Structure formats: structure tokens, C-alpha cells
Design a protein around this ligand. Structure first.
Ligand SMILES: Cn1cc(NS(=O)(=O)N2CCC[C@H](C(N)=O)C2)cn1
Ligand SMILES: [Zn+2]
Length: 139
């Protein structure tokens, strides 16, 4: 679990969104596994605006942060799960590292701020849903 809080927005994995998230829906994209809902309180997270390919992510299944190199956002095949059939997930970045499903929502951060959140995993790789292109999160 986990979310990004920036301005009056909350960014979560779409497959973990709550009833309140859907009742205050701002934007959602099944192909990216993202959902953004509105909040009443102000968010203070800083979103990175860059092309970094190195950062640190939080892994709840190890209670640890790991430094990683990660690929540029791209269209990646994701095998079927209880939340989606087998499909291409867009704007996904991969790194060599550990993750389990409950790790979804952990933040990946570079020197510039929040890059994205844990979204996929398996075969010793971890995938992060990029949020650097969502320029509207800051206005
Ligand atoms: C973070 N993580 C996720 C998994 N398992 S998964 O890749 O099957 N995952 C299950 C939950 C939905 C995910 C998606 N974005 O389609 C895929 C293992 N580690
Ligand atoms: Zn960066």
C-alpha cells in the first residue's frame, strides 16, 4: 500500500483505490494502473520533472529502501492477476529488485523528487508506474 500526496491530489495504484478514491475521482487510467483522487488537505510531496534512470524505492516486504537503476517509461506486457487480465501496461519502468504485491504503492524517488510508485513485480524485477509526465499534478 501507499500513495503520493501533492497539492489537492492523492495518487494511488488504481487496483488498490478505495470507495472514497472513486467517489472523489479526478483521473484514472487502467493501462497505467494509476488513479488520482481529490483531497481536502494540502499535499507536500515534490514530483520529479526529469529523465533520471537511478533512484531509491521503499520495499515494505523488507522494511528497507533500495537504490536501483530503472528503465525509461515504456509499454510492457503484464501477466494476468486477480485485478487485471494479461495486458500491456504503459508508462512502466523496470529495475532488478525484490517486490511482492503488497509492496504496491511504495515510492520511487530520485534527486529531483517523486518519480513513481511500485506497480508490478516477478522474476526478480520490480516495475514502477511513472508520474513525471503528469504535469497537471502541480496545478
Ligand atoms: C509489486 N508487485 C506486484 C506483483 N505482482 S503482479 O505483478 O502480478 N501485480 C499484481 C497486482 C496488479 C499489478 C498490475 N499493475 O497489473 C501486477 C509483485 N510485486
Ligand atoms: Zn530525477
Amino acid at each position: 500500500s501507499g500513495a503520493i500526496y501533492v497539492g489537492n491530489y492523492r495518487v494511488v495504484n488504481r487496483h488498490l483505490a478505495t470507495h472514497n478514491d472513486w467517489a472523489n475521482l479526478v483521473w484514472e487510467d487502467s493501462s497505467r494502473d494509476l488513479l488520482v483522487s481529490s483531497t481536502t488537505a494540502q499535499g507536500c510531496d515534490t514530483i520529479a520533472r526529469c529523465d533520471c534512470q537511478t533512484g531509491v524505492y521503499y520495499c515494505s516486504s523488507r522494511r528497507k529502501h533500495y537504490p536501483v537503476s530503472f528503465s525509461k517509461p515504456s509499454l510492457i506486457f503484464v501477466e494476468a492477476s486477480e485485478y487485471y487480465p494479461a495486458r500491456y501496461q504503459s508508462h512502466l519502468m523496470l529495475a532488478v529488485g525484490h517486490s511482492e504485491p503488497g509492496d504496491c504503492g511504495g515510492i520511487l524517488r530520485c534527486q529531483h523528487g517523486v518519480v513513481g510508485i511500485v506497480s508490478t513485480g516477478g522474476n526478480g524485477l520490480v516495475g514502477f508506474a511513472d508520474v513525471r509526465d503528469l504535469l497537471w499534478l502541480d496545478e
